[PDB]
Amino acid sequence: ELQEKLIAVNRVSKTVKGGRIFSFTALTVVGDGNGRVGFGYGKAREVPAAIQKAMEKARRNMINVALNNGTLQHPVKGVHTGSRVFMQPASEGTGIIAGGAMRAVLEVAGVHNVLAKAYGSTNPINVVRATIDGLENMNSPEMVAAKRGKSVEEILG
Amino acid sequence: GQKVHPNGIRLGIVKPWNSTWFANTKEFADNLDSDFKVRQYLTKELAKASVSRIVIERPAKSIRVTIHTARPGIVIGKKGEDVEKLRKVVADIAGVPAQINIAEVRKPELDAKLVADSITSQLERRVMFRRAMKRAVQNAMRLGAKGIKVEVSGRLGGAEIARTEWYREGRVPLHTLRADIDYNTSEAHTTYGVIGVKVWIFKGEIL
Amino acid sequence: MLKAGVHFGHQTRYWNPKMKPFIFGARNKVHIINLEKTVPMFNEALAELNKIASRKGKILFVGTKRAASEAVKDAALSCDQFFVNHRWLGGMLTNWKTVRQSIKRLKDLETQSQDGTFDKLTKKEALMRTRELEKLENSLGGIKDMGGLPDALFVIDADHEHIAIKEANNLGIPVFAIVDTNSDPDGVDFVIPGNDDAIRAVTLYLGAVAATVREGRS
RNA sequence: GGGCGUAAAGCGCACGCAGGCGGUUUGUUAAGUCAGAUGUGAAAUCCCCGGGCUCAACCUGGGAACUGCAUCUGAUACUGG
RNA sequence: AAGGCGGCCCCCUGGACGAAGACUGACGCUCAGGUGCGAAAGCGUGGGGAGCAAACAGGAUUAGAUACCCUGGUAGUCCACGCCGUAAACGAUGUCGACUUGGAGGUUGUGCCCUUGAGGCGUGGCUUCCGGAGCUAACGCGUUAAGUCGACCGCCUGGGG
RNA sequence: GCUGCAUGGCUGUCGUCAGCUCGUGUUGUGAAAUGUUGGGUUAAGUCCCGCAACGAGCGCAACCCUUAUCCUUUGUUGCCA
RNA sequence: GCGGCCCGCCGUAA
């Protein structure tokens, strides 16, 4: 049932007394298509080994987010070492217009309408943190109403 | 050139010879030549069969040949007509009368010679080598063995230097004389030169 | 309770500032623990352990400090529980799959041990096998016959055994450590303030827990 | 809607005029600010609701927009006198 | 304030801090252009000259040695009165104000208690070293912030040229 | 006949030197680290103790040949108390 | 505790 995506693969070296030895890294994302998503990162000497090793690593690491009809009501931003990510709700009919790994993350998450945009550096590994960046730090109406000791209908009004 | 031949170093301890007979100086050369001729002819003829090992023994006025195989039906035919033709040809090659025997290979995934030329045959049909190596290793580990190592070397499609790869899991001790190591090689001719294949199988340590 | 059968913190210069709510007035150069807020949550933790043992939770005991060693090994193996006595290995929980092989080797060797020299009289091999059995039993004696992944852990010293606490937090298992003035409440823990190196204190600690667990089965 | 310890970037250090920014009540003023109203802000172009050329480019009807300026009336929480 | 300031004594003179009490009543912060103060070297006029020492002269070393090493040695280093206005002038961190978990010291005041003793409780100023959350590309900073904020000023826009 | 710089196979050397890696688990955004480091020993990553590591593989050692001491069997073409 | 000893043509593994 779980849907998986592959983001990027690259070759990585290391120097020893006899020369250089090479290895590969894989970055994958996994989501349920409803609001739960995770990511994993693996290393190996051969590409399929790293590909498979990232998968279950992503599977064990999962979080849940609360969306609303395919998005939420928060223009939210998230930051990491060198990435700034901006996402905001889209009305309807639009898609997942977004540059790189943000596309895959928002697709596996379950979102169908968003207006994302990325600033700063754009290496895949840091920008994938867009999940942890702002997705789970989003607030739904009922939770805000409960936390503020109020009712939802007058929270909206 | 660093490794001693695994089969040669164990011929006196835990391994038998392939040719067993006694002779003097006057007949050594021609005995060896006749054995070479018959072995080469049999290997050529039974290429479509699954031949593993040929053992030649010389009774006083005769020659005895035993063939190990995994598909004895094809070698032995509907009736014994094909073995009769082979016996006639062998008795032609070596003047003394000949008698033929057939052996049976129970587990073809062992006995590295068969694995090696199977991999070469796969390579001739233009298949990715990694799949073949992994397939053979998994089969051998599944049928029960404490170790196996395979390797391929040569022009693997690219023009750059012949690259070498090898996979191994389990135990393959080469410095222990007590070990039962079965080793054989093969080669495959393609459109880009020849490719070498070597296989080690660890059947089990012998006291 | 009322016997005040527990000592108090070490010193006012070796103390974690996170323990300000639990601290009492310090007089003799050393910190004093407020006992007025140690009974209720202690009883709550006892009730929690009781309901877990009624659910055959397979509680686990730790606390290697050369003082609680014999005490925890006596409290365990008494009702129905297991214990760790020496050299908590890094990865008993996060890497349990590998420790299963060590348990299996121990089982094989203890089966062979009862008739050890009969199989072979080469004394060197028998000697080294017995030596390795001794080396292996201390680190796995209390855990050999347990199913795997217990449902609760009781810890004597919090900061001294932080590796076990981190493993439990990673796995997601409730823990019941005892926190002193030089430790800090970090994991999801039923906190029991009080001294942890006083023999009377630790004995009072384990007696109630052992009695509660042995009652929980019935 | 960016930066200045080491990537480019804090004057060698002070005093100080013009400028920029003001701790707290009370009372007045309505300058800033806010709400209405009126006069203007050409037509054409853009947008919306329509119509006619076999449809479309094309032409046309009505409406919003023209973020502004001035004048009058009112409000007094926050800046200013 | 910065550059910086060390034998002892006298004369003239500036700033900081603490205790208690009284007084005036927002009199404040920052500051383009302007003004002042700035190590060493260097310049002008007049003195002084022990040691040290650019330039310079010999002796070595070296393939060569206009250097490092050795023997000498002038300007200069010192004083008075004027110029010059630059330094890795560096905490490579601009000036004010407010808020935010802790330990171990140094130095200088003051209150109380037996003031017994090198005692015990506090309470101000200025300075070293570890380290939490947080921040940071990382190194690290961490109540004397590179943390959370406000006011004003000065600077940056690929490397050479 | 040309191409060992298109290859297989087979050799030399560092060097009979004692090292070289992997699975799982943790630490770091990452290249990676940890284990393999630390105390004592050995010809030796040979071993004990300690330690967020827990175990494995190729290596080391041992199994092979020959030489040094005795005991059974056999006694020619070999030996003579 | 201090005597001396300089250089290495142009491009070029995936």
mmCIF file with all atom_site columns, all heavy atoms in Angstrom, chain F residues 39-46:
data_model
loop_
_atom_site.group_PDB
_atom_site.id
_atom_site.type_symbol
_atom_site.label_atom_id
_atom_site.label_alt_id
_atom_site.label_comp_id
_atom_site.label_asym_id
_atom_site.label_entity_id
_atom_site.label_seq_id
_atom_site.pdbx_PDB_ins_code
_atom_site.Cartn_x
_atom_site.Cartn_y
_atom_site.Cartn_z
_atom_site.occupancy
_atom_site.B_iso_or_equiv
_atom_site.pdbx_formal_charge
_atom_site.auth_seq_id
_atom_site.auth_comp_id
_atom_site.auth_asym_id
_atom_site.auth_atom_id
_atom_site.pdbx_PDB_model_num
ATOM 1   P P     . G F 1 39 ? 47.796 3.047   26.748 1.00 0.00 ? 39 G F P     1
ATOM 2   O OP1   . G F 1 39 ? 48.797 4.016   27.252 1.00 0.00 ? 39 G F OP1   1
ATOM 3   O OP2   . G F 1 39 ? 48.103 2.229   25.551 1.00 0.00 ? 39 G F OP2   1
ATOM 4   O "O5'" . G F 1 39 ? 47.419 2.063   27.945 1.00 0.00 ? 39 G F "O5'" 1
ATOM 5   C "C5'" . G F 1 39 ? 47.603 2.446   29.301 1.00 0.00 ? 39 G F "C5'" 1
ATOM 6   C "C4'" . G F 1 39 ? 47.695 1.242   30.205 1.00 0.00 ? 39 G F "C4'" 1
ATOM 7   O "O4'" . G F 1 39 ? 46.447 0.509   30.163 1.00 0.00 ? 39 G F "O4'" 1
ATOM 8   C "C3'" . G F 1 39 ? 48.747 0.212   29.828 1.00 0.00 ? 39 G F "C3'" 1
ATOM 9   O "O3'" . G F 1 39 ? 50.034 0.545   30.318 1.00 0.00 ? 39 G F "O3'" 1
ATOM 10  C "C2'" . G F 1 39 ? 48.193 -1.077  30.418 1.00 0.00 ? 39 G F "C2'" 1
ATOM 11  O "O2'" . G F 1 39 ? 48.478 -1.154  31.805 1.00 0.00 ? 39 G F "O2'" 1
ATOM 12  C "C1'" . G F 1 39 ? 46.694 -0.875  30.254 1.00 0.00 ? 39 G F "C1'" 1
ATOM 13  N N9    . G F 1 39 ? 46.143 -1.519  29.051 1.00 0.00 ? 39 G F N9    1
ATOM 14  C C8    . G F 1 39 ? 46.025 -0.964  27.806 1.00 0.00 ? 39 G F C8    1
ATOM 15  N N7    . G F 1 39 ? 45.463 -1.761  26.946 1.00 0.00 ? 39 G F N7    1
ATOM 16  C C5    . G F 1 39 ? 45.187 -2.902  27.676 1.00 0.00 ? 39 G F C5    1
ATOM 17  C C6    . G F 1 39 ? 44.579 -4.110  27.279 1.00 0.00 ? 39 G F C6    1
ATOM 18  O O6    . G F 1 39 ? 44.149 -4.432  26.171 1.00 0.00 ? 39 G F O6    1
ATOM 19  N N1    . G F 1 39 ? 44.493 -5.012  28.325 1.00 0.00 ? 39 G F N1    1
ATOM 20  C C2    . G F 1 39 ? 44.932 -4.780  29.597 1.00 0.00 ? 39 G F C2    1
ATOM 21  N N2    . G F 1 39 ? 44.748 -5.781  30.463 1.00 0.00 ? 39 G F N2    1
ATOM 22  N N3    . G F 1 39 ? 45.503 -3.655  29.989 1.00 0.00 ? 39 G F N3    1
ATOM 23  C C4    . G F 1 39 ? 45.596 -2.770  28.979 1.00 0.00 ? 39 G F C4    1
ATOM 24  P P     . G F 1 40 ? 51.349 -0.005  29.581 1.00 0.00 ? 40 G F P     1
ATOM 25  O OP1   . G F 1 40 ? 52.526 0.577   30.267 1.00 0.00 ? 40 G F OP1   1
ATOM 26  O OP2   . G F 1 40 ? 51.174 0.184   28.120 1.00 0.00 ? 40 G F OP2   1
ATOM 27  O "O5'" . G F 1 40 ? 51.335 -1.569  29.875 1.00 0.00 ? 40 G F "O5'" 1
ATOM 28  C "C5'" . G F 1 40 ? 51.433 -2.060  31.201 1.00 0.00 ? 40 G F "C5'" 1
ATOM 29  C "C4'" . G F 1 40 ? 51.158 -3.539  31.264 1.00 0.00 ? 40 G F "C4'" 1
ATOM 30  O "O4'" . G F 1 40 ? 49.796 -3.821  30.858 1.00 0.00 ? 40 G F "O4'" 1
ATOM 31  C "C3'" . G F 1 40 ? 51.994 -4.407  30.346 1.00 0.00 ? 40 G F "C3'" 1
ATOM 32  O "O3'" . G F 1 40 ? 53.295 -4.633  30.852 1.00 0.00 ? 40 G F "O3'" 1
ATOM 33  C "C2'" . G F 1 40 ? 51.151 -5.668  30.229 1.00 0.00 ? 40 G F "C2'" 1
ATOM 34  O "O2'" . G F 1 40 ? 51.310 -6.483  31.379 1.00 0.00 ? 40 G F "O2'" 1
ATOM 35  C "C1'" . G F 1 40 ? 49.736 -5.090  30.242 1.00 0.00 ? 40 G F "C1'" 1
ATOM 36  N N9    . G F 1 40 ? 49.173 -4.944  28.888 1.00 0.00 ? 40 G F N9    1
ATOM 37  C C8    . G F 1 40 ? 49.029 -3.790  28.166 1.00 0.00 ? 40 G F C8    1
ATOM 38  N N7    . G F 1 40 ? 48.489 -3.987  26.998 1.00 0.00 ? 40 G F N7    1
ATOM 39  C C5    . G F 1 40 ? 48.263 -5.352  26.947 1.00 0.00 ? 40 G F C5    1
ATOM 40  C C6    . G F 1 40 ? 47.698 -6.151  25.928 1.00 0.00 ? 40 G F C6    1
ATOM 41  O O6    . G F 1 40 ? 47.270 -5.797  24.829 1.00 0.00 ? 40 G F O6    1
ATOM 42  N N1    . G F 1 40 ? 47.650 -7.488  26.283 1.00 0.00 ? 40 G F N1    1
ATOM 43  C C2    . G F 1 40 ? 48.094 -7.992  27.473 1.00 0.00 ? 40 G F C2    1
ATOM 44  N N2    . G F 1 40 ? 47.974 -9.312  27.650 1.00 0.00 ? 40 G F N2    1
ATOM 45  N N3    . G F 1 40 ? 48.626 -7.258  28.433 1.00 0.00 ? 40 G F N3    1
ATOM 46  C C4    . G F 1 40 ? 48.677 -5.955  28.105 1.00 0.00 ? 40 G F C4    1
ATOM 47  P P     . U F 1 41 ? 54.458 -5.134  29.871 1.00 0.00 ? 41 U F P     1
ATOM 48  O OP1   . U F 1 41 ? 55.755 -5.012  30.578 1.00 0.00 ? 41 U F OP1   1
ATOM 49  O OP2   . U F 1 41 ? 54.273 -4.470  28.560 1.00 0.00 ? 41 U F OP2   1
ATOM 50  O "O5'" . U F 1 41 ? 54.143 -6.679  29.689 1.00 0.00 ? 41 U F "O5'" 1
ATOM 51  C "C5'" . U F 1 41 ? 54.815 -7.439  28.706 1.00 0.00 ? 41 U F "C5'" 1
ATOM 52  C "C4'" . U F 1 41 ? 53.981 -8.605  28.254 1.00 0.00 ? 41 U F "C4'" 1
ATOM 53  O "O4'" . U F 1 41 ? 52.598 -8.197  28.124 1.00 0.00 ? 41 U F "O4'" 1
ATOM 54  C "C3'" . U F 1 41 ? 54.336 -9.153  26.888 1.00 0.00 ? 41 U F "C3'" 1
ATOM 55  O "O3'" . U F 1 41 ? 55.443 -10.026 26.922 1.00 0.00 ? 41 U F "O3'" 1
ATOM 56  C "C2'" . U F 1 41 ? 53.041 -9.807  26.443 1.00 0.00 ? 41 U F "C2'" 1
ATOM 57  O "O2'" . U F 1 41 ? 52.874 -11.062 27.076 1.00 0.00 ? 41 U F "O2'" 1
ATOM 58  C "C1'" . U F 1 41 ? 52.009 -8.842  27.017 1.00 0.00 ? 41 U F "C1'" 1
ATOM 59  N N1    . U F 1 41 ? 51.598 -7.806  26.046 1.00 0.00 ? 41 U F N1    1
ATOM 60  C C2    . U F 1 41 ? 50.860 -8.180  24.944 1.00 0.00 ? 41 U F C2    1
ATOM 61  O O2    . U F 1 41 ? 50.536 -9.329  24.714 1.00 0.00 ? 41 U F O2    1
ATOM 62  N N3    . U F 1 41 ? 50.510 -7.160  24.106 1.00 0.00 ? 41 U F N3    1
ATOM 63  C C4    . U F 1 41 ? 50.815 -5.831  24.260 1.00 0.00 ? 41 U F C4    1
ATOM 64  O O4    . U F 1 41 ? 50.429 -5.025  23.417 1.00 0.00 ? 41 U F O4    1
ATOM 65  C C5    . U F 1 41 ? 51.573 -5.519  25.426 1.00 0.00 ? 41 U F C5    1
ATOM 66  C C6    . U F 1 41 ? 51.927 -6.494  26.260 1.00 0.00 ? 41 U F C6    1
ATOM 67  P P     . U F 1 42 ? 56.680 -9.767  25.942 1.00 0.00 ? 42 U F P     1
ATOM 68  O OP1   . U F 1 42 ? 57.908 -10.303 26.572 1.00 0.00 ? 42 U F OP1   1
ATOM 69  O OP2   . U F 1 42 ? 56.628 -8.341  25.541 1.00 0.00 ? 42 U F OP2   1
ATOM 70  O "O5'" . U F 1 42 ? 56.333 -10.656 24.671 1.00 0.00 ? 42 U F "O5'" 1
ATOM 71  C "C5'" . U F 1 42 ? 55.925 -12.004 24.827 1.00 0.00 ? 42 U F "C5'" 1
ATOM 72  C "C4'" . U F 1 42 ? 55.146 -12.483 23.633 1.00 0.00 ? 42 U F "C4'" 1
ATOM 73  O "O4'" . U F 1 42 ? 53.893 -11.761 23.540 1.00 0.00 ? 42 U F "O4'" 1
ATOM 74  C "C3'" . U F 1 42 ? 55.794 -12.253 22.282 1.00 0.00 ? 42 U F "C3'" 1
ATOM 75  O "O3'" . U F 1 42 ? 56.797 -13.202 21.973 1.00 0.00 ? 42 U F "O3'" 1
ATOM 76  C "C2'" . U F 1 42 ? 54.601 -12.284 21.339 1.00 0.00 ? 42 U F "C2'" 1
ATOM 77  O "O2'" . U F 1 42 ? 54.182 -13.618 21.107 1.00 0.00 ? 42 U F "O2'" 1
ATOM 78  C "C1'" . U F 1 42 ? 53.537 -11.590 22.185 1.00 0.00 ? 42 U F "C1'" 1
ATOM 79  N N1    . U F 1 42 ? 53.457 -10.144 21.893 1.00 0.00 ? 42 U F N1    1
ATOM 80  C C2    . U F 1 42 ? 52.733 -9.763  20.789 1.00 0.00 ? 42 U F C2    1
ATOM 81  O O2    . U F 1 42 ? 52.175 -10.559 20.064 1.00 0.00 ? 42 U F O2    1
ATOM 82  N N3    . U F 1 42 ? 52.687 -8.420  20.553 1.00 0.00 ? 42 U F N3    1
ATOM 83  C C4    . U F 1 42 ? 53.281 -7.436  21.302 1.00 0.00 ? 42 U F C4    1
ATOM 84  O O4    . U F 1 42 ? 53.149 -6.263  20.965 1.00 0.00 ? 42 U F O4    1
ATOM 85  C C5    . U F 1 42 ? 54.013 -7.906  22.433 1.00 0.00 ? 42 U F C5    1
ATOM 86  C C6    . U F 1 42 ? 54.075 -9.215  22.685 1.00 0.00 ? 42 U F C6    1
ATOM 87  P P     . A F 1 43 ? 58.158 -12.724 21.271 1.00 0.00 ? 43 A F P     1
ATOM 88  O OP1   . A F 1 43 ? 58.934 -13.926 20.891 1.00 0.00 ? 43 A F OP1   1
ATOM 89  O OP2   . A F 1 43 ? 58.769 -11.685 22.133 1.00 0.00 ? 43 A F OP2   1
ATOM 90  O "O5'" . A F 1 43 ? 57.668 -12.022 19.931 1.00 0.00 ? 43 A F "O5'" 1
ATOM 91  C "C5'" . A F 1 43 ? 58.596 -11.534 18.974 1.00 0.00 ? 43 A F "C5'" 1
ATOM 92  C "C4'" . A F 1 43 ? 58.068 -11.713 17.576 1.00 0.00 ? 43 A F "C4'" 1
ATOM 93  O "O4'" . A F 1 43 ? 58.174 -13.102 17.200 1.00 0.00 ? 43 A F "O4'" 1
ATOM 94  C "C3'" . A F 1 43 ? 56.598 -11.374 17.396 1.00 0.00 ? 43 A F "C3'" 1
ATOM 95  O "O3'" . A F 1 43 ? 56.409 -9.998  17.123 1.00 0.00 ? 43 A F "O3'" 1
ATOM 96  C "C2'" . A F 1 43 ? 56.159 -12.275 16.248 1.00 0.00 ? 43 A F "C2'" 1
ATOM 97  O "O2'" . A F 1 43 ? 56.455 -11.669 15.001 1.00 0.00 ? 43 A F "O2'" 1
ATOM 98  C "C1'" . A F 1 43 ? 57.071 -13.485 16.420 1.00 0.00 ? 43 A F "C1'" 1
ATOM 99  N N9    . A F 1 43 ? 56.437 -14.647 17.067 1.00 0.00 ? 43 A F N9    1
ATOM 100 C C8    . A F 1 43 ? 56.627 -15.067 18.355 1.00 0.00 ? 43 A F C8    1
ATOM 101 N N7    . A F 1 43 ? 55.982 -16.162 18.659 1.00 0.00 ? 43 A F N7    1
ATOM 102 C C5    . A F 1 43 ? 55.342 -16.496 17.481 1.00 0.00 ? 43 A F C5    1
ATOM 103 C C6    . A F 1 43 ? 54.496 -17.557 17.149 1.00 0.00 ? 43 A F C6    1
ATOM 104 N N6    . A F 1 43 ? 54.144 -18.511 18.009 1.00 0.00 ? 43 A F N6    1
ATOM 105 N N1    . A F 1 43 ? 54.020 -17.609 15.892 1.00 0.00 ? 43 A F N1    1
ATOM 106 C C2    . A F 1 43 ? 54.382 -16.650 15.036 1.00 0.00 ? 43 A F C2    1
ATOM 107 N N3    . A F 1 43 ? 55.171 -15.600 15.229 1.00 0.00 ? 43 A F N3    1
ATOM 108 C C4    . A F 1 43 ? 55.621 -15.581 16.489 1.00 0.00 ? 43 A F C4    1
ATOM 109 P P     . A F 1 44 ? 55.393 -9.129  18.000 1.00 0.00 ? 44 A F P     1
ATOM 110 O OP1   . A F 1 44 ? 55.784 -7.704  17.885 1.00 0.00 ? 44 A F OP1   1
ATOM 111 O OP2   . A F 1 44 ? 55.313 -9.759  19.336 1.00 0.00 ? 44 A F OP2   1
ATOM 112 O "O5'" . A F 1 44 ? 54.002 -9.311  17.250 1.00 0.00 ? 44 A F "O5'" 1
ATOM 113 C "C5'" . A F 1 44 ? 53.842 -8.880  15.909 1.00 0.00 ? 44 A F "C5'" 1
ATOM 114 C "C4'" . A F 1 44 ? 52.753 -9.646  15.208 1.00 0.00 ? 44 A F "C4'" 1
ATOM 115 O "O4'" . A F 1 44 ? 53.074 -11.056 15.216 1.00 0.00 ? 44 A F "O4'" 1
ATOM 116 C "C3'" . A F 1 44 ? 51.377 -9.572  15.845 1.00 0.00 ? 44 A F "C3'" 1
ATOM 117 O "O3'" . A F 1 44 ? 50.672 -8.397  15.480 1.00 0.00 ? 44 A F "O3'" 1
ATOM 118 C "C2'" . A F 1 44 ? 50.714 -10.852 15.356 1.00 0.00 ? 44 A F "C2'" 1
ATOM 119 O "O2'" . A F 1 44 ? 50.231 -10.684 14.035 1.00 0.00 ? 44 A F "O2'" 1
ATOM 120 C "C1'" . A F 1 44 ? 51.895 -11.820 15.313 1.00 0.00 ? 44 A F "C1'" 1
ATOM 121 N N9    . A F 1 44 ? 51.986 -12.673 16.512 1.00 0.00 ? 44 A F N9    1
ATOM 122 C C8    . A F 1 44 ? 52.620 -12.394 17.693 1.00 0.00 ? 44 A F C8    1
ATOM 123 N N7    . A F 1 44 ? 52.544 -13.353 18.578 1.00 0.00 ? 44 A F N7    1
ATOM 124 C C5    . A F 1 44 ? 51.815 -14.334 17.932 1.00 0.00 ? 44 A F C5    1
ATOM 125 C C6    . A F 1 44 ? 51.388 -15.603 18.337 1.00 0.00 ? 44 A F C6    1
ATOM 126 N N6    . A F 1 44 ? 51.651 -16.118 19.535 1.00 0.00 ? 44 A F N6    1
ATOM 127 N N1    . A F 1 44 ? 50.677 -16.336 17.460 1.00 0.00 ? 44 A F N1    1
ATOM 128 C C2    . A F 1 44 ? 50.418 -15.816 16.259 1.00 0.00 ? 44 A F C2    1
ATOM 129 N N3    . A F 1 44 ? 50.762 -14.633 15.763 1.00 0.00 ? 44 A F N3    1
ATOM 130 C C4    . A F 1 44 ? 51.466 -13.932 16.662 1.00 0.00 ? 44 A F C4    1
ATOM 131 P P     . G F 1 45 ? 50.409 -7.239  16.558 1.00 0.00 ? 45 G F P     1
ATOM 132 O OP1   . G F 1 45 ? 50.614 -5.923  15.912 1.00 0.00 ? 45 G F OP1   1
ATOM 133 O OP2   . G F 1 45 ? 51.189 -7.578  17.767 1.00 0.00 ? 45 G F OP2   1
ATOM 134 O "O5'" . G F 1 45 ? 48.866 -7.382  16.918 1.00 0.00 ? 45 G F "O5'" 1
ATOM 135 C "C5'" . G F 1 45 ? 47.852 -6.847  16.075 1.00 0.00 ? 45 G F "C5'" 1
ATOM 136 C "C4'" . G F 1 45 ? 46.579 -7.651  16.167 1.00 0.00 ? 45 G F "C4'" 1
ATOM 137 O "O4'" . G F 1 45 ? 45.433 -6.785  15.942 1.00 0.00 ? 45 G F "O4'" 1
ATOM 138 C "C3'" . G F 1 45 ? 46.454 -8.794  15.162 1.00 0.00 ? 45 G F "C3'" 1
ATOM 139 O "O3'" . G F 1 45 ? 45.785 -9.899  15.766 1.00 0.00 ? 45 G F "O3'" 1
ATOM 140 C "C2'" . G F 1 45 ? 45.564 -8.193  14.086 1.00 0.00 ? 45 G F "C2'" 1
ATOM 141 O "O2'" . G F 1 45 ? 44.852 -9.133  13.313 1.00 0.00 ? 45 G F "O2'" 1
ATOM 142 C "C1'" . G F 1 45 ? 44.632 -7.322  14.913 1.00 0.00 ? 45 G F "C1'" 1
ATOM 143 N N9    . G F 1 45 ? 44.026 -6.228  14.153 1.00 0.00 ? 45 G F N9    1
ATOM 144 C C8    . G F 1 45 ? 44.684 -5.230  13.486 1.00 0.00 ? 45 G F C8    1
ATOM 145 N N7    . G F 1 45 ? 43.884 -4.405  12.879 1.00 0.00 ? 45 G F N7    1
ATOM 146 C C5    . G F 1 45 ? 42.619 -4.893  13.154 1.00 0.00 ? 45 G F C5    1
ATOM 147 C C6    . G F 1 45 ? 41.350 -4.411  12.758 1.00 0.00 ? 45 G F C6    1
ATOM 148 O O6    . G F 1 45 ? 41.085 -3.427  12.067 1.00 0.00 ? 45 G F O6    1
ATOM 149 N N1    . G F 1 45 ? 40.323 -5.193  13.251 1.00 0.00 ? 45 G F N1    1
ATOM 150 C C2    . G F 1 45 ? 40.498 -6.302  14.024 1.00 0.00 ? 45 G F C2    1
ATOM 151 N N2    . G F 1 45 ? 39.380 -6.928  14.401 1.00 0.00 ? 45 G F N2    1
ATOM 152 N N3    . G F 1 45 ? 41.673 -6.768  14.404 1.00 0.00 ? 45 G F N3    1
ATOM 153 C C4    . G F 1 45 ? 42.687 -6.017  13.936 1.00 0.00 ? 45 G F C4    1
ATOM 154 P P     . U F 1 46 ? 46.079 -11.392 15.258 1.00 0.00 ? 46 U F P     1
ATOM 155 O OP1   . U F 1 46 ? 46.996 -11.311 14.103 1.00 0.00 ? 46 U F OP1   1
ATOM 156 O OP2   . U F 1 46 ? 44.785 -12.100 15.105 1.00 0.00 ? 46 U F OP2   1
ATOM 157 O "O5'" . U F 1 46 ? 46.879 -12.048 16.465 1.00 0.00 ? 46 U F "O5'" 1
ATOM 158 C "C5'" . U F 1 46 ? 47.500 -13.317 16.330 1.00 0.00 ? 46 U F "C5'" 1
ATOM 159 C "C4'" . U F 1 46 ? 47.696 -13.979 17.669 1.00 0.00 ? 46 U F "C4'" 1
ATOM 160 O "O4'" . U F 1 46 ? 48.841 -13.418 18.346 1.00 0.00 ? 46 U F "O4'" 1
ATOM 161 C "C3'" . U F 1 46 ? 46.559 -13.804 18.654 1.00 0.00 ? 46 U F "C3'" 1
ATOM 162 O "O3'" . U F 1 46 ? 45.513 -14.724 18.414 1.00 0.00 ? 46 U F "O3'" 1
ATOM 163 C "C2'" . U F 1 46 ? 47.237 -13.995 20.005 1.00 0.00 ? 46 U F "C2'" 1
ATOM 164 O "O2'" . U F 1 46 ? 47.340 -15.371 20.321 1.00 0.00 ? 46 U F "O2'" 1
ATOM 165 C "C1'" . U F 1 46 ? 48.641 -13.457 19.739 1.00 0.00 ? 46 U F "C1'" 1
ATOM 166 N N1    . U F 1 46 ? 48.894 -12.122 20.333 1.00 0.00 ? 46 U F N1    1
ATOM 167 C C2    . U F 1 46 ? 48.739 -10.962 19.602 1.00 0.00 ? 46 U F C2    1
ATOM 168 O O2    . U F 1 46 ? 48.372 -10.920 18.448 1.00 0.00 ? 46 U F O2    1
ATOM 169 N N3    . U F 1 46 ? 49.025 -9.804  20.275 1.00 0.00 ? 46 U F N3    1
ATOM 170 C C4    . U F 1 46 ? 49.449 -9.681  21.574 1.00 0.00 ? 46 U F C4    1
ATOM 171 O O4    . U F 1 46 ? 49.666 -8.562  22.036 1.00 0.00 ? 46 U F O4    1
ATOM 172 C C5    . U F 1 46 ? 49.591 -10.918 22.263 1.00 0.00 ? 46 U F C5    1
ATOM 173 C C6    . U F 1 46 ? 49.320 -12.061 21.633 1.00 0.00 ? 46 U F C6    1
#
